Amino acid sequence: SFNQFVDYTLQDIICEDSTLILEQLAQHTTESDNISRKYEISFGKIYVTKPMVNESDGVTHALYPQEARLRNLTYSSGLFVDVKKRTYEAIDVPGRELKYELIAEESEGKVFIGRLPIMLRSKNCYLSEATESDLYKLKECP
């Protein structure tokens, strides 16, 4: 269930509401201000890291579950999504349908969205690929 959630369900949740569109209108207080702006943020593919921890000083290192148990940490990994920004504009005149066009400013660029706690011995966890000798080396019970 956890591997299904990580591998497929996260991307589906992202793709359900990937688009976020903010519309600025003409603001026709003057005839020189006849431009309407369409501001769109789209979420792309989502990336997950290996389990990990940042410390107080900002140093970030791989977190193994034994240390997480010892240091009262949370055995979690980061989530990164691809965010592209679409900005559109249209000359707003009354009596005509608005036709927005890309201003060719599409900046894109993974952004960190949060830390997903990782179930142990899942496909993202370190212990899934570990052998018995590796588990002994990591002080984990086979």
């Binding site: 569109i21 903010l22 519309e23 600025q24 209108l25 603001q27 026709h28 369409k38």
Partner: peptide, 9 residues
């Protein structure tokens, strides 16, 4: 009198 920004579903 205009509402300025708005949500676009």
């Amino acid at each position: 009198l205009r509402r300025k920004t708005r949500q676009l579903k």
